[PDB]
Design a protein around this ligand. Sequence first.
Ligand SMILES: Nc1ncnc2c1ncn2[C@@H]1O[C@H](CSCC[C@H](N)C(=O)O)[C@@H](O)[C@H]1O
Ligand SMILES: [Cl-]
Ligand SMILES: [Zn+2]
Length: 419
Amino acid sequence: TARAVTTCRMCGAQDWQEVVDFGPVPLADSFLEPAASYDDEPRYPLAVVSCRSCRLMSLTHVVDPEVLYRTYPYTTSDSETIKKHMGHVVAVCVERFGIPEGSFVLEIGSNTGSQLKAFQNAGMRTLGIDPARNIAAVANERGIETLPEFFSVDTAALVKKTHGTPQLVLGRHVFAHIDDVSAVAEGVRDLLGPDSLFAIEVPYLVDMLERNEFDTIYHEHLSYIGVGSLVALFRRHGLRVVDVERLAVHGGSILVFVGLDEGTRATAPVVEELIALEKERGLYEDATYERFARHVAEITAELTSMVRSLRAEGKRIAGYGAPAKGNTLLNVCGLTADDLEFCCDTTEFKQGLVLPGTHIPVRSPEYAKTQAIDYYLLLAWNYGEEILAKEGPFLADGGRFILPNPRPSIVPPGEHHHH
Ligand SMILES: Nc1ncnc2c1ncn2[C@@H]1O[C@H](CSCC[C@H](N)C(=O)O)[C@@H](O)[C@H]1O
Ligand SMILES: [Cl-]
Ligand SMILES: [Zn+2]
């Protein structure tokens, strides 16, 4: 039921090195009602391959986007970390490129519309595009105009006709979720004026490799992207990569700016620097990806044995957060409700549900606080700093966290960290 990849999404070649294969795995954002059995739970092959031409890393299969996104789960309350990062995105886009007030900003994958709201607060006109009908209706209700559609060449034309030429087109994380990136590039080209920019924020393949972030591999994430593969793609569609900012968010990301090849925006030197860096760090060599694969095997084994060793000693263990990536981690490690008695999560609709595959219960933070947990496995480790900042009481009582990457570790460490 999920379609197999043939040619490379970015460059069009067909020379794939196998990197890792996790077998059939259930969908990471498909949380389940508790039940006696889960025999009909859908599973899809989860494996990654590396294109030797441009070094896009890609999943072997594309799960149907209508199935994934047409009813996507959301939250109505964004954390201060998320709000701060959304404010920073605005600041970078507007200040780095001198976007005047009253300019038009189009966002692909605009979701609840919070990122657009931040652009409006900075004095911009906005429009969103997001296929999740449930989420789009919420955004529209709040006053953030949103087209309940997938981005395409045809939607691009409808936008230009009714809303004009955007000074900025933004895609936050969504770009790695789209199979037909060639169509996106074409719709963008049509939309862009001479000094318009297309900006995309995606997890950075360099960081993913170096920090062993294999839990970010899940079916929604079709692509795992470095600057090289984006240049290869945009070359073929009259677009030029003009600038890149590296960011610590989501385990290391890149915010990439793209313009018309013959437009006003000059290419900054950082672009070539990052491509040279990617070469230098071995992204074009088979050994690198074989090295990634064994790190994964090593971390997976070590993590499982740590949890089970602590359990055998009579320590109680739970998951902190129930993010999509947590479900890759737990499934790949083969952990069950005997290993983690629950996963706490602040997202209301998740509370009372059960995790895909492992079927571990999801409970509220307020339930979590009634329980004498000794260790929390930090599944939402990309928010480690914000989480640790508010878990003083737990830490003071001798509670500990297990961090899965770069290697498995225990917080707090045995000595003060100052080196
Ligand atoms: N081809 C496509 N065009 C536009 N939006 C898409 C899309 N595929 C998925 N999406 C939307 O993008 C989001 C998935 S990505 C989630 C990241 C989101 N931008 C955020 O930071 O909050 C969902 O809201 C989904 O409905
Ligand atoms: Cl994502
Ligand atoms: Zn390629």
